[PDB]
Amino acid sequence: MDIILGIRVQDSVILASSKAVTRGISVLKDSDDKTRQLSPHTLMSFAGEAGDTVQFAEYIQANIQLYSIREDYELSPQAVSSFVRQELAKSIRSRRPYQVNVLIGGYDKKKNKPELYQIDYLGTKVELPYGAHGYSGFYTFSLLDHHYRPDMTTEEGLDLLKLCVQELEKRMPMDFKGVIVKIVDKDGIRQVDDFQAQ
Amino acid sequence: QFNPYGDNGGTILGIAGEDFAVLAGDTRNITDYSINSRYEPKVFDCGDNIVMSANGFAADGDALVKRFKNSVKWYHFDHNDKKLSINSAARNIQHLLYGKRFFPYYVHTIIAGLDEDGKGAVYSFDPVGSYEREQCRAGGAAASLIMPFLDNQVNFKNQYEPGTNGKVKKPLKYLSVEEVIKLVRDSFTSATERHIQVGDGLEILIVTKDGVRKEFYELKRD
Amino acid sequence: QIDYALTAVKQGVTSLGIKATNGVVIATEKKSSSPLAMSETLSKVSLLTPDIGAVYSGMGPDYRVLVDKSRKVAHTSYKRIYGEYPPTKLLVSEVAKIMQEATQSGGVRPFGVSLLIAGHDEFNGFSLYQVDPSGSYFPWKATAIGKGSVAAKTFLEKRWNDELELEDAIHIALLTLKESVEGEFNGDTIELAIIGDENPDLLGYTGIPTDKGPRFRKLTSQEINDRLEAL
Amino acid sequence: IFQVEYALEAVKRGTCAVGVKGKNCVVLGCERRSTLKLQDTRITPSKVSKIDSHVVLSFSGLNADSRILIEKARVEAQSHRLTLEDPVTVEYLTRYVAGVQQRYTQSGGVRPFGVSTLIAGFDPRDDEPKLYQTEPSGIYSSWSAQTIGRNSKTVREFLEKNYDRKEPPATVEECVKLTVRSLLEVVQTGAKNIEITVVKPDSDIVALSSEEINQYVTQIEQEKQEQ
Amino acid sequence: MFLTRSEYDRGVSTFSPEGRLFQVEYSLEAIKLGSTAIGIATKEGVVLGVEKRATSPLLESDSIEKIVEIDRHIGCAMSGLTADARSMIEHARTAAVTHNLYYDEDINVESLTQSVCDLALRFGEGASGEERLMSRPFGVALLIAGHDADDGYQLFHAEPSGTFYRYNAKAIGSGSEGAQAELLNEWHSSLTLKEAELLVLKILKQVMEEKLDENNAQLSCITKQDGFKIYDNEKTAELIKELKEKEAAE
Amino acid sequence: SPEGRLYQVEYALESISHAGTAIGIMASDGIVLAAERKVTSTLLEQDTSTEKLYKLNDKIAVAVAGLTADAEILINTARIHAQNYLKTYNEDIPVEILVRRLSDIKQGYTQHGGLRPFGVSFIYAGYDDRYGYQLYTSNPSGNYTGWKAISVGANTSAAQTLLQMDYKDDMKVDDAIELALKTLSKTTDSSALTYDRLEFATIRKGANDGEVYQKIFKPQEIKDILVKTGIT
Amino acid sequence: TTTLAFRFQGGIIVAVDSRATAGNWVASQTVKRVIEINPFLLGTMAGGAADCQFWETWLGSQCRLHELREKERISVAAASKILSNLVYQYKGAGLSMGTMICGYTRKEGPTIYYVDSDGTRLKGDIFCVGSGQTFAYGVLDSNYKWDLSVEDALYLGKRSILAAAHRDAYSGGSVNLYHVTEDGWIYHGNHDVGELFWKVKEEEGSFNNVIG
């Protein structure tokens, strides 16, 4: 793996996601959006097993675009979360288990708060200020512990994010070929395409 | 534990002519180090001018031949006695073999006959049904002792025109069914000497627009 | 068609039930299809759980296979999950559901019986229920079903107060049954059961003080005759 | 086996439904009796139903029957995006809906649907308006414009003599201008009776409210009386 | 006036005392009562025409699909419940590709036809031996026309009953009894595609008792070379114009 | 189904105008449910049944007018949908979604015409934080409808009229408790209304905070609010 | 095995080797490593010999079936997601395939999807796959402009395959070339690697450490 990051601030949630796709010996693509939009104000980044990864995220995309369309209501993050969880917990005692880890981040239009949820391929779900899957956590959690305030402006938090990626490029053996940073707030899901040099 | 598989060796070779095709196999059928029969044929007439050979594990090849010979009986009844295009039997065999994809017929399998244009054709198969059309392919144990030689004396590989330095490749000729038969029965007399799984008898089926003919030649019995 | 089954219930031997303050009582008569038959080999008042009994009016067989299907459903759907036995209200529910399905299912006729199910659960106390072929079910202070239905139901309004001791309700349900009786009237042609105090006498074992034995007691041929003399 | 025609009757009796193609836009319209005084206004204004981000659908018929369609469709709409990654094309969503009312006759022997439906929207990318109509039989047809429902015949007559292919209502605004007039004929009070939705190229579906509907009726019956 | 009635009318999949299965004898009269459809075979192609019958300027014809492709070499025309034949076609398209996969060749028109009949041959609600899973005879007739290299160009009539004949030229639908007796008069073993393109129109003009255009007629053909194309409205018109003239001959 | 008619439905839709009589009134800060009880015998046990007023979840409840054994088959499966939408999304089920879920099973028979339609008509009273307090209706037609005040069963056409008359949008909850009882003045075949012919329910703005208490009235609590006028 | 495909101004180039081996033994060099699916789409055999031929042949069917049913050409995006989905259905039953699905449509432009046994589906511009994949990538990466003359970019495929056939023992034989335009694909011959090597050493001045 395969870098999946995310930090929830005051007014939004931010998700980092390595750009690289590696097939054993060669790096096949240097530009992979490792995230599906689940709805206007809810984003899901993901990493894990080869094919299992995308096929899951798209199944969830479908099922949430369907509940959106049906009740003409934007399903709240807490709920999209607790649904994605159940769908993983279901597949863990199944025949071939989805082997996928995800970060769900979105804006609860009703509490006007940002929320970040972390769910592993087992169905283990917990809500966090910041989170990560794979080994991404070891190099970066020590920095977040230290520099994180929950009142951080969206700008203050992008800064702290670049600092983590920098540490991962320094002490991590994998060449993950950068990140794509996406932001989720009241206005929805936008992507900062000026990052590896901000 | 129970192993549902075997080897019976033997060795087959299929060659596509211009107005003909030959499909040859040895007559020896073995298990390990003993001999089972000196005469138990490997190459079969299937009707509609199609000869085939499913070589490797006898029970699996015998069973695949049966199953195709039957696919013909029914393409008859089902499509008013129509002739099975060589190219169409190949594809039906792909579907036959891949049917048992996850428990394959352990056979390298070759068919020969005439394409819809009258020219000679030969097709080779995986045990899982990859098929390509071939000029000449050998399958079986002694496959490796035949092909190099054929590449050289049939497709004139690595052969140049004398005294042209090495710039003019020896010009590809086309060969009488009588010449191909020469090369076949020398490919085999050769292999028989250096492969212990080859010997006993050599049977060739020959397809022309006139039908299917059997020639048979003896092989060293050691 | 449910209506025609309620009709088989309207004829067929009378049976009744009376709830009291400290117990419930249910009874019917044992009409002997012959004097050659030994009427002790057939029970119109059957135990479902040691806290719950039942009586019927109508088609004999349909009652048997309903008492059986009913006992089983008490384990399969409650005891094997929660370790307790079911409460009267809910076991009754699970029987109505059973009969209501013979209704709304194709290829089968509803049952020719109305049931009176009597019992005691720790939280709801005593209670007495009626279940009809329709699958509907109603809670009763007291009622009767069958031929003598109308005579007896009228006598129960006249004689019932909400201060009856169980012994008072036994007394009533004997008079009530004496006016309707078709054959003879003794302990051999009356079946009476009660849902009263816990009977430790009848547990079969002694050593755990937390389970105290059956509330359901079926009065013996003798106990009945004894009450009919001082009657 | 005739029960088909009977259902097609229930169509007739139901909430009246219309639709109208444009130079580059599409519109529906339909509904029933304002409010029986005491009914909740704000919780079933579900006249036209959204199928995908770019495809809508109205119906004339048993309201309780539509829902079973407006779902089986809202679903195949996703189950197409999912197994082919490509929004459903308006003809296909339509052929799937109609193909279902069809299979509700010829097998098992079960009852057919009490709905005709109109289905509108733009295919993905392509900006050429599409409008279709289904009926309990299994028939789908494309229309430059159409109506089905109650007193639907009065409207189909109106429209025929008011739409021409040579010049289709190009303006967004004016394309609605027309769809209104055509329901005022059959309603039973006016603006308070039937409402509308509007879809423009590339998943831009914006349904109209009460206040935009009366900057229309009361800008129609102005030009009207002027003789 | 007067009333003739047998006691075995009605009867569903049970024999009359004659051996007649009236449920299906009637299935066959309702072909005579749908859209007109006509097929003619030359040695240079096969032509299929139908009656569109547009019922408005709004309804943009062409959602009237009464002629459809099956593979590039096989087309069919239909008279009757066009909606009831959705499944009949799906099975034919599916069978023709399925054959192409399993065998690397286009599927014989004779056998593509028989396969469609073998489908409507699963009519019933109670069968022991082999199961026939469906509900009613298939309520639509087909003209199936195409080309394989064994038996030249071909025309076929597939009936709901599951059987078929190979007509050298056939008409089904509202006009059939009459159109048919007209083809029986004007067809020869030596027609040219040009000649039959037109004879199909002449016979649609007749048994429609009307003057025809591209809003009420659709023409299609199937050649060895170009495959199975359906004439767009322009071509169908200067084919029509070309008759307005040819018949003003005498 | 001759003229565009749902026969087997009208059959049971008018079988409804026989049994029971139920009412729902939506106030601005609460909701109210109420029903009359079937032809009662002296000896029927009043307090137990809760025979025509059933709880669905801590935030939703229904009044019934129809065959009891028939609604229990429905309610059992609706109390479950509630809990499946919990275990699944960890939020309480939204009222409209539950209503539709049933209405869709009702219409399930209104079409797979191989089994028999549903007795029963429902008034649903529920709260969810998306659409304030809600009032819904469910005939076996399959249709549901929004209501500020509604009624089903015998003497239906009559009460709908008194309701239309005394209702005001600014209404409180206690004001609507009366309007419900008051207008079972008329729509009562039993001359004089007792606490035992009744069953009642409320969904208020909580007995304390900004939240939602639910309350199926115990017999005594009825004879207490009946005290406000009805009988004394 | 070596297979490669890439996008450019003039569409898509596909190039493959043709060697197929059973260990040290070379069993055929007459392998069609490019699969003519239908005349508007190509797939590249790489991984499992049969597994590729078969499901892509099958794809060709499900593709016709789709054009008849919608009277319109199927989009590379959906052609590929059909194969990706059918193959993910058999995950770890032991399927082996690694293939580039290639097409040029009105709506999408030149479009390449990489699809493998694992269930992966990836849109890209440049994909090489097989034993000699790394060698091809080397040549492609250094000499790849987007606006390449259709004739220069066809030569690039011819040669990124050469680099690989040379080094890799398991690639070699002959090179098959394909060009994909909006109007369909066009074969560009089968050039035997034997003779082609020498032709390139002279004209390019390259392969300088190969005494000849």
Short mmCIF file of N, CA and C in Angstrom, two decimals, chain B residues 71 75 78-80 82 85 87-88 91-92 95 131, chain E residues 99-108 110-111 150:
data_model
loop_
_atom_site.label_atom_id
_atom_site.label_comp_id
_atom_site.label_asym_id
_atom_site.label_seq_id
_atom_site.Cartn_x
_atom_site.Cartn_y
_atom_site.Cartn_z
N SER B 71 -20.13 -33.89 -31.89
CA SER B 71 -20.53 -32.52 -32.19
C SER B 71 -20.82 -32.38 -33.66
N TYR B 75 -24.26 -31.31 -35.69
CA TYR B 75 -24.27 -30.15 -36.55
C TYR B 75 -24.87 -30.57 -37.87
N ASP B 78 -28.79 -30.86 -37.02
CA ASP B 78 -29.24 -29.49 -36.69
C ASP B 78 -29.21 -28.48 -37.84
N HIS B 79 -28.36 -28.70 -38.84
CA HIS B 79 -28.23 -27.76 -39.96
C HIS B 79 -28.28 -28.44 -41.32
N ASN B 80 -29.18 -29.41 -41.48
CA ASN B 80 -29.39 -30.12 -42.75
C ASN B 80 -28.11 -30.63 -43.42
N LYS B 82 -25.08 -30.14 -43.43
CA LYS B 82 -24.02 -29.19 -43.83
C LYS B 82 -22.59 -29.64 -43.48
N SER B 85 -17.08 -26.47 -41.68
CA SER B 85 -15.92 -25.67 -42.07
C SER B 85 -14.75 -26.06 -41.17
N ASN B 87 -12.38 -24.27 -40.17
CA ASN B 87 -12.27 -23.14 -39.25
C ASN B 87 -13.35 -23.10 -38.18
N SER B 88 -14.49 -23.76 -38.44
CA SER B 88 -15.62 -23.77 -37.51
C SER B 88 -15.50 -24.88 -36.50
N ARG B 91 -13.12 -23.61 -33.80
CA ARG B 91 -13.82 -22.81 -32.80
C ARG B 91 -14.73 -23.64 -31.90
N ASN B 92 -15.33 -24.69 -32.43
CA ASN B 92 -16.21 -25.50 -31.59
C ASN B 92 -15.38 -26.27 -30.57
N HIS B 95 -14.51 -24.11 -27.61
CA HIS B 95 -15.61 -24.10 -26.65
C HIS B 95 -15.77 -25.43 -25.92
N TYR B 131 -6.45 -21.39 -29.56
CA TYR B 131 -6.20 -21.99 -30.87
C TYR B 131 -5.59 -20.98 -31.82
N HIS E 99 -24.45 -18.42 -32.26
CA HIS E 99 -23.97 -19.38 -33.22
C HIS E 99 -22.65 -18.91 -33.79
N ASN E 100 -22.54 -17.61 -34.03
CA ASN E 100 -21.34 -17.04 -34.62
C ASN E 100 -20.13 -17.22 -33.72
N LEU E 101 -20.38 -17.20 -32.43
CA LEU E 101 -19.34 -17.40 -31.43
C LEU E 101 -18.89 -18.85 -31.41
N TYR E 102 -19.83 -19.76 -31.18
CA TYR E 102 -19.54 -21.18 -31.08
C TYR E 102 -18.97 -21.81 -32.37
N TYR E 103 -19.09 -21.13 -33.51
CA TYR E 103 -18.77 -21.77 -34.80
C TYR E 103 -18.04 -20.91 -35.85
N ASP E 104 -17.84 -19.62 -35.60
CA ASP E 104 -17.05 -18.78 -36.51
C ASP E 104 -17.65 -18.70 -37.90
N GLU E 105 -18.97 -18.55 -37.97
CA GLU E 105 -19.66 -18.45 -39.25
C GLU E 105 -21.03 -17.89 -39.01
N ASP E 106 -21.59 -17.23 -40.02
CA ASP E 106 -22.97 -16.75 -39.98
C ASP E 106 -23.92 -17.93 -39.95
N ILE E 107 -25.03 -17.78 -39.24
CA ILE E 107 -25.94 -18.90 -39.01
C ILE E 107 -26.96 -19.04 -40.12
N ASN E 108 -27.15 -20.26 -40.62
CA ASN E 108 -28.12 -20.55 -41.70
C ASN E 108 -29.51 -19.95 -41.47
N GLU E 110 -32.32 -20.94 -42.53
CA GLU E 110 -33.26 -22.00 -42.22
C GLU E 110 -33.22 -22.30 -40.72
N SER E 111 -32.03 -22.39 -40.16
CA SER E 111 -31.89 -22.77 -38.76
C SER E 111 -32.12 -21.62 -37.80
N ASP E 150 -25.15 -21.55 -48.64
CA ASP E 150 -25.65 -22.86 -49.06
C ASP E 150 -26.85 -22.73 -49.99
#
